[PDB]
Amino acid sequence: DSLAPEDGSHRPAAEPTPPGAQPTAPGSLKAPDTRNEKLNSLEDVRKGSENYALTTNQGVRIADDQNSLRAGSRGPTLLEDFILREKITHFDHERIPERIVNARGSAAHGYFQPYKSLSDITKADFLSDPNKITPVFVRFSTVQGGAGSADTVRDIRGFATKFYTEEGIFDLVGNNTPIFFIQDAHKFPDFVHAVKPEPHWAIPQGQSAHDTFWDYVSLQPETLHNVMWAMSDRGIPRSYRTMEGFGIHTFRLINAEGKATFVRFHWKPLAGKASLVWDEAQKLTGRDPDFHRRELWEAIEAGDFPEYE
Amino acid sequence: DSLAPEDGSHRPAAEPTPPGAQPTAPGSLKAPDTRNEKLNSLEDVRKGSENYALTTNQGVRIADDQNSLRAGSRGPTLLEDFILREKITHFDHERIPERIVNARGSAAHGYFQPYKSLSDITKADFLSDPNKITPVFVRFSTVQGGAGSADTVRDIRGFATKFYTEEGIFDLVGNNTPIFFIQDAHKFPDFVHAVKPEPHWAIPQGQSAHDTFWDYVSLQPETLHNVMWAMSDRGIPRSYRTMEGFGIHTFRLINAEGKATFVRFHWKPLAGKASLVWDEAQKLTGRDPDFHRRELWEAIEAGDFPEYELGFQLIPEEDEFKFDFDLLDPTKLIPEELVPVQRVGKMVLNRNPDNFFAENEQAAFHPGHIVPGLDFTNDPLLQGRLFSYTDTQISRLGGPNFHEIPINRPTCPYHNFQRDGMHRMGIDTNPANYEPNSINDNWPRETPPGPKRGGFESYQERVEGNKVRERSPSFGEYYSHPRLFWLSQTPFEQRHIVDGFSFELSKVVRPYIRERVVDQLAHIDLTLAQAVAKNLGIELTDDQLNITPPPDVNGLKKDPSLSLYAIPDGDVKGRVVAILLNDEVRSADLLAILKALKAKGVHAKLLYSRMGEVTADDGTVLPIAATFAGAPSLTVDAVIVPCGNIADIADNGDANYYLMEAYKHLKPIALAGDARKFKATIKIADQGEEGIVEADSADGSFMDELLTLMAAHRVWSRIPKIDKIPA
Amino acid sequence: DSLAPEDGSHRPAAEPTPPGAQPTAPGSLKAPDTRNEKLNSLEDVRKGSENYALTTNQGVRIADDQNSLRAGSRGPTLLEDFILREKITHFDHERIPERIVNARGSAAHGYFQPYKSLSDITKADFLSDPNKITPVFVRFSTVQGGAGSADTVRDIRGFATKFYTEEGIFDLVGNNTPIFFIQDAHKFPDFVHAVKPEPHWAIPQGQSAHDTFWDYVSLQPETLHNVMWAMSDRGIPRSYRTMEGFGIHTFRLINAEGKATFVRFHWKPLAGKASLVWDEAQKLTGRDPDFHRRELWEAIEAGDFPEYELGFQLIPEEDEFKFDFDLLDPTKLIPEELVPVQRVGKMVLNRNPDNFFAENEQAAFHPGHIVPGLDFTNDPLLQGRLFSYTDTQISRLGGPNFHEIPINRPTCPYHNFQRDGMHRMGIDTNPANYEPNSINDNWPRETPPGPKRGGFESYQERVEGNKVRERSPSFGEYYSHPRLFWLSQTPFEQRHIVDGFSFELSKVVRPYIRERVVDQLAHIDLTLAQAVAKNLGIELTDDQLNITPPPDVNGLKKDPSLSLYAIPDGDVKGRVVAILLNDEVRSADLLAILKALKAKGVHAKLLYSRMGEVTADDGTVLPIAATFAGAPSLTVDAVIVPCGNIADIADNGDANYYLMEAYKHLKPIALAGDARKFKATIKIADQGEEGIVEADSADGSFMDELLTLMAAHRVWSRIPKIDKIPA
Amino acid sequence: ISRLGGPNFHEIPINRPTCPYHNFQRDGMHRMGIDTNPANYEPNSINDNWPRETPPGPKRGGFESYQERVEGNKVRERSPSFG
Numbered sequence A: 001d002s003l004a005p006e007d008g009s010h011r012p013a014a015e016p017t018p019p020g021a022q023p024t025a026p027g028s029l030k031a032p033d034t035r036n037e038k039l040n041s042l043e044d045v046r047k048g049s050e051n052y053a054l055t056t057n058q059g060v061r062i063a064d065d066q067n068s069l070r071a072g073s074r075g076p077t078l079l080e081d082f083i084l085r086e087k088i089t090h091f092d093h094e095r096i097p098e099r100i101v102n103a104r105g106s107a108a109h110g111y112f113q114p115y116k117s118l119s120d121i122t123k124a125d126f127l128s129d130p131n132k133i134t135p136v137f138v139r140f141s142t143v144q145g146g147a148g149s150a151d152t153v154r155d156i157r158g159f160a161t162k163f164y165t166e167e168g169i170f171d172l173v174g175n176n177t178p179i180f181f182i183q184d185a186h187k188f189p190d191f192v193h194a195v196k197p198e199p200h201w202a203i204p205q206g207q208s209a210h211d212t213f214w215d216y217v218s219l220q221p222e223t224l225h226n227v228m229w230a231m232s233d234r235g236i237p238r239s240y241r242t243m244e245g246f247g248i249h250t251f252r253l254i255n256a257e258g259k260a261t262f263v264r265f266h267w268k269p270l271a272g273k274a275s276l277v278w279d280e281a282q283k284l285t286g287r288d289p290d291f292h293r294r295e296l297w298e299a300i301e302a303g304d305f306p307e308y309e
Numbered sequence B, C: 001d002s003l004a005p006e007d008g009s010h011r012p013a014a015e016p017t018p019p020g021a022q023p024t025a026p027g028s029l030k031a032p033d034t035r036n037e038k039l040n041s042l043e044d045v046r047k048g049s050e051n052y053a054l055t056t057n058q059g060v061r062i063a064d065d066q067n068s069l070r071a072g073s074r075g076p077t078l079l080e081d082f083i084l085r086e087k088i089t090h091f092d093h094e095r096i097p098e099r100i101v102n103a104r105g106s107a108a109h110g111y112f113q114p115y116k117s118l119s120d121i122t123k124a125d126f127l128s129d130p131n132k133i134t135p136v137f138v139r140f141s142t143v144q145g146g147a148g149s150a151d152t153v154r155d156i157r158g159f160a161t162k163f164y165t166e167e168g169i170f171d172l173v174g175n176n177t178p179i180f181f182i183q184d185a186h187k188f189p190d191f192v193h194a195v196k197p198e199p200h201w202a203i204p205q206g207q208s209a210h211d212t213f214w215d216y217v218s219l220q221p222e223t224l225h226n227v228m229w230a231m232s233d234r235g236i237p238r239s240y241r242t243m244e245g246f247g248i249h250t251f252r253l254i255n256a257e258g259k260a261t262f263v264r265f266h267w268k269p270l271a272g273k274a275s276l277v278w279d280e281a282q283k284l285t286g287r288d289p290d291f292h293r294r295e296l297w298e299a300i301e302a303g304d305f306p307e308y309e310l311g312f313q314l315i316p317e318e319d320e321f322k323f324d325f326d327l328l329d330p331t332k333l334i335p336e337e338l339v340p341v342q343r344v345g346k347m348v349l350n351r352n353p354d355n356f357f358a359e360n361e362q363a364a365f366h367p368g369h370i371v372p373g374l375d376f377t378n379d380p381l382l383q384g385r386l387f388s389y390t391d392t393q394i395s396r397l398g399g400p401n402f403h404e405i406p407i408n409r410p411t412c413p414y415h416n417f418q419r420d421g422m423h424r425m426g427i428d429t430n431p432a433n434y435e436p437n438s439i440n441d442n443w444p445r446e447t448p449p450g451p452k453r454g455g456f457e458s459y460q461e462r463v464e465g466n467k468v469r470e471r472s473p474s475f476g477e478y479y480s481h482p483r484l485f486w487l488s489q490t491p492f493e494q495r496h497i498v499d500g501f502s503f504e505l506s507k508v509v510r511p512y513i514r515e516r517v518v519d520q521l522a523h524i525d526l527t528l529a530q531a532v533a534k535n536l537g538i539e540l541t542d543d544q545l546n547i548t549p550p551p552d553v554n555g556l557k558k559d560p561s562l563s564l565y566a567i568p569d570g571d572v573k574g575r576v577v578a579i580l581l582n583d584e585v586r587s588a589d590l591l592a593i594l595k596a597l598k599a600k601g602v603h604a605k606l607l608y609s610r611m612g613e614v615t616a617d618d619g620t621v622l623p624i625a626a627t628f629a630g631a632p633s634l635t636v637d638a639v640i641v642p643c644g645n646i647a648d649i650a651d652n653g654d655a656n657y658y659l660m661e662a663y664k665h666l667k668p669i670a671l672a673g674d675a676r677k678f679k680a681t682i683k684i685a686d687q688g689e690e691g692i693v694e695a696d697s698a699d700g701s702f703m704d705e706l707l708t709l710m711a712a713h714r715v716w717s718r719i720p721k722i723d724k725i726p727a
Numbered sequence D: 001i002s003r004l005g006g007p008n009f010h011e012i013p014i015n016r017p018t019c020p021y022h023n024f025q026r027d028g029m030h031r032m033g034i035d036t037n038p039a040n041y042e043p044n045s046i047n048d049n050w051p052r053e054t055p056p057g058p059k060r061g062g063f064e065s066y067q068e069r070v071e072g073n074k075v076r077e078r079s080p081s082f083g
């Protein structure tokens, strides 16, 4: 029954369109011609739907997906209804633990390519040739809030990039500020517990504006540098497209002759640096808690691809 | 080290204190003298901290919890740092899957007691004696959003009560609306998938205002009744304390004689029914996403215990078919004009948890957790629920021993032949792990059914029919209940319903879905449909204007119990008032204002343009609770501006906007002396207007008038005046 | 009900009883007054059963535990049967992943006590006073097989002791051989994958006798030393009570002054060293795959408590490089002739668990669980183990709160800022979940290292070198320890080793692997290599014959402490004798037999061709424990055949085979009066043979002779004679 | 669900059907299939209600239980015929 409108306005055009012009859609249907080696490699698990019969997970066609099996139309549901139980069982087990930190995040596919060979300072294959493209998958995130918390909170933002290189996956897992709050990993649980919702009542969500965070900061002056960044407008970016990204740590580059060079990684937003103002950001967590997620998705559907150097 | 301040101001007093007066704290520390059988039984797992050495989980004292073990102080961290690794490992594994629905929830401990024995209609032990107290653990929730989502969203609210009875755990797992969206549990995943964040991008959170929800609603008319409730102000409650609770399904009560009585469960809020207005609720999700969680916790810390009256709609077996609707259809309510709610008992929530994760996050409620004296019915939604909770809890709580997690444990005896499973805590000494057995003389043994302390036996309901996947024809009526609900609302409630539909449908990107929903509304009521259509720039067809309205429900053209506000039931205790200070406040106004509020248990928050203190006209030092922007009018029920140096705040944008916002959201505003200068901000006539208290000072009838407005909750007569107003 | 027998013979007496006298039972019911701190602290989770009603896990009494709820007594089962679903759900989820290695294990509770204060060499609280009793939980295991595999396989044995000290849990996780197969933990998965069942078909179980194991060994000569122990009779212990225990790695003892002393841990069996013989062991995996688990349980129930002496090999820090092997290489042992074992204390295992799954299956041991007074070393095998146990337990035991599982709980205080995790039991009331904090005055607080009750601080070992993935050159010597072990064995122990290699390599399908293994043996000892090669139809090459043997170990050409039997250490208490009865047994023989056995604490099993009883010549009624086939000689240590009507059993094939099997397996046999007729089945000369007790009757001298043989364990001089016995 | 770690055990290679399988079930631990359907529910108009239900029939039809006659009370009772 319940069918699409006659005019076909239920389906978004598969061409770049401005935000709001068409209903948003899964990437492979919105931009079928946009590919990369990783995107193509996911074809083994992509599942369509149009023109296929509704089935159980074992491939049995379902005749009536509106009712449970019962003894009489007003009777008790029977245990032998295996269609209902598979359906409900799968629903019941949909959730998986959210990330301990950075549970709230938005991601997209893309590609990277070096401007020139960096073989003099590093033997890394993905930086060896300007015409050698590396598929990426990037996730941007907040840190404190759960997966269902709001986007435009005052918080640090995570900027994680997975490079599918020819010599292995390289993940550049960074943030939008060039330093971290603490010095030794042993204190991570202390810091994260202080900034997260307080343990007796689990308040507040997506906010450092509570006693335990400031208590810890006040007793651990090493945190002050990243606190300054958080309290500035860096803490409330206008978009994931308009913030800087940093690996934070000094890592090493190793060339073919064995020479080590210390390196700190940066991402420069080619859309420029831009942040909200607090009143706006806070109110926006209420009016559209999915603002950044939406903005990233719509920029990509519009052809305004987020670009970073 | 010894980091606490020497005045001991880091620790909150272990006595009831109003919201904001002291730091909040774990329940057992805040109210150590508030006890109950369950709270006492959790003592075995409560862990203190003061004066104990910091250790690993194996009990090894830690000397340096600031650093990793490394080779050299600037060297690499060593794999032998077992202290670092245990600490990071426990951290790494802190999260568990959130609930599939109702992930966002706030809970508290309490107790229940029946007014009188209900032995004539049920043998349920917890309802058998007025002097029998049953500890309870209640969790209130939203439905769609994750555990980190906002509280004051527009959504149904969950109201689950775990009764720790002497004959077993009884969980009454209800909602704040008396019907559900769908009829059969097999469509639960469809409905839930439609309302949750859409699968390509996981938007939107905590909202039904998106295409898939309204697509599903438009194709499944059975959902219209509960959708009406969600679009009304019922979907945005002021607090968990001011909403009704319902079991929804028709269950059975079974007495000692074996007689079955049909029953629908109700919870009546003793603080009355009260809801927010959409703009306020929405903005409040931004200014304070934890508003309801906070409000509940602080009410209990203040001694404003949430109290609810359990009530039963009772229907004799012989009257099963006497209504226009099917008793087993969960999309149909039972009008209180037809079947009154008989008062059964009182539930008082009087202690917050100690640890949210341990007690709240791990709590597991199940509508299938019934006790002798209660039974199920063939409601097809209920039927499927019985399977679901059992199943979901095995992955959410990591195994089949979730009943051993402290909060879920029965306070009564539990013995059986079940063994092992992940995280098994109970060490069984029974030689036998099967029955029948002779090696332990068959213990533990079965117990026959009986009047008291007997085994569970299902009511012998006659079953007759063929095995079919078929909806009962009696369930195929979708518009009369929605219409009954609509007609029972006040005119301003109706407007809010129209506004809820209009706002939500405006967020539906595909216009034909909007049109399809408008068409369904035209089968309910032409006035409703027309008003929503107008707001969406849609014109009803001549055929839509001629759709004959659905019949009344058993001759009823309205039932005032369905309205939040038709019948006044306002209770001011626990409410809060913002007091906008100035640098030379009239101390006499403050005295009168604060004592009058305190006399009725209404809280106050002293606000200013900065933190710290202000000095009143007589030298009184006034501690500021928050700034005007820090604690917006959204969080209070009324606003009072005392006399003093008004020029201090007269040109303060925040102070003026505070009143505009509170004015727009129909809250009482009271202005004393020169604070009347603020009348021009909100466009109040010289003569004054209903809903604005004003006088030369806050002395005689000023506070009584303000409290009368607070008793009525909001100034509905101001609706037309807020139409303009840029706020 | 009342299914138990009216005589009360279903319930075992709660007093020490010999093996087979009573049905075995949960520890707390068998020995209710055997107590220790740990056992008493588990009382909060022990659950009874007698006189309780059968309930759901929610405490709801069950009336009918025999039937599902159905529509009609021949109708479909209904989804609303919550009793059935909870019961089946728990059953469906009883299993948890078995241990990755050492899945097969048997455990018991006990206690440890030092012989004197060791405060001069360690500040470990549990070694500080002879009057300090430390509860322990010990799990003995095989390595390769699953939890359902057999006990008497040829394998290394694990010997894990959990010490519940006042300053934290200390787990000493050792084996029954003093070295490990590999040097670096990075190759652990490689070695374990090679020994475990092969990946295509998952064969073979509990056996190293397959291609991949010997492929790896042949390509990794570091393995040869432990391989030599595994191939000796050390790989087939008689019982967990009769094997040595070793921590293997060099660890550190840290005293109050901060001085570090290198230490290797040892467990000396006070019942002495004793192993089976290969045929007996292999046959015993088929006749009783639970032989060692049973033997341990029954020894404890009988009061034959497994007792071990904790021993330390102590090496001054300055002596680190004084040996010709690296102290940090786990494939090297420290000869007791060079560094003697200091006797430090004794551990007694005196109580069985209540529930195997709850206490044994869920126990979690970790070598990284150390306490102040102990420290690690750079042993590269130990280093990698530090990471592994933490990690495997988060999936095996379902979360990071496995220390809250009753058996794993420390008995001393544990307080920290760690929170949540699946199945969180402890409800933390600390206002703070981080440090530093002022809101709880920084509690729980760090504690500086000190002489007693101080926090953990690592010994400040100097680390100097580049970040390298490199084996120390000092570890590159693979044949001198194997040679030292080989030369320390008696001639028959050497013969059993040859036979072990010969049997195992015969099951290696690819002939080149056997050849490569023989080549490695030629680098150890020419006689060893030749004997194995001859059994494999392999001829050593010219070059193989000329391989110069490895050098002695610091001048040692042997060390008798490496042999099981070179130095007498036999103990007969707890051993068992099979007594083969006939229908008219000479009652005077039984009386003398049983009296002598009972004086030495030796148990007896009365065997016949059927169950029930036989009557002695004087009317004494003798109850039969089992049949000749039902309880084969494999399960006993010696066989005694008393006088009487031998014609009853002289033609009994099973009776004759009983003796031929015991004879083949070098067990002492005693024949009284006409039982000497049986001499013909095992071809014993008329004038007798050492190892066969024979006399006109079974008086006192006969019993002394048999008990003397039993103290020497087996009749090793019979080896050459068993060739010609068809058994 | 516990032995094989979640509700997607049908995506474990040996368990996978060789015939087509399409439905509105989503997520769960170790989800392999990446659904492109705009809808994760039915009835839906946004994907023209696909994948769709199929009436029972002689071949390639939807599953419909045999309409066996059920009559009796809700009892926990063994049939006397089994005794």
Ligand code: HEM
Residues within 6 Å of the ligand: A098, A099, A100, A101, A102, A105, A139, A140, A141, A157, A158, A159, A160, A173, A174, A175, A179, A180, A184, A185, A186, A188, A247, A248, A249, B088, B092
């Ligand atoms: C420079 C400091 C750090 C940065 C820039 C950083 C960055 C991030 C980012 C961007 C994510 C989210 C990845 C995603 O989108 O899935 C993340 C997750 C995480 N971080 Fe780090 N982090 C830092 C420090 C730490 C430390 C010190 C620890 C622990 C010692 C830690 C533990 C974690 C964990 C456990 C997760 C969750 C990963 C998952 O569930 O897949 N982070 N971090």
Ligand code: HEM
Residues within 6 Å of the ligand: A088, A092, B098, B099, B100, B101, B102, B105, B139, B140, B141, B157, B158, B159, B160, B173, B174, B175, B179, B180, B184, B185, B188, B247, B248, B249, B330, B363, B364, B365, B381, B382, B384, B385, B386, B388, B389, B392, B393, B396
């Ligand atoms: C009358 C209709 C229903 C009502 C009143 C209702 C009420 C609730 C409430 C209040 C909760 C959260 C309890 C808590 O606070 O932990 C909940 C959770 C849940 N509901 Fe229901 N629900 C209804 C329909 C259904 C249906 C039809 C199903 C599936 C067949 C279902 C499956 C679930 C599941 C799986 C959970 C999560 C439970 C857990 O993780 O412990 N619900 N429901």
Ligand code: HEM
Residues within 6 Å of the ligand: C098, C099, C100, C101, C102, C105, C139, C140, C141, C157, C158, C159, C160, C173, C174, C175, C179, C180, C184, C185, C186, C188, C247, C248, C249, C330, C363, C364, C365, C381, C382, C384, C385, C388, C389, C392, C393, C396
């Ligand atoms: C000196 C060498 C070793 C000895 C003496 C040893 C001893 C043991 C013992 C006795 C057990 C079983 C404990 C019980 O009864 O539950 C065990 C289990 C285990 N071993 Fe070790 N092992 C050694 C090497 C290693 C190495 C090198 C690794 C990995 C790097 C390792 C990883 C494991 C794991 C993962 C378990 C399972 C623990 C559990 O599931 O709780 N072992 N080992």
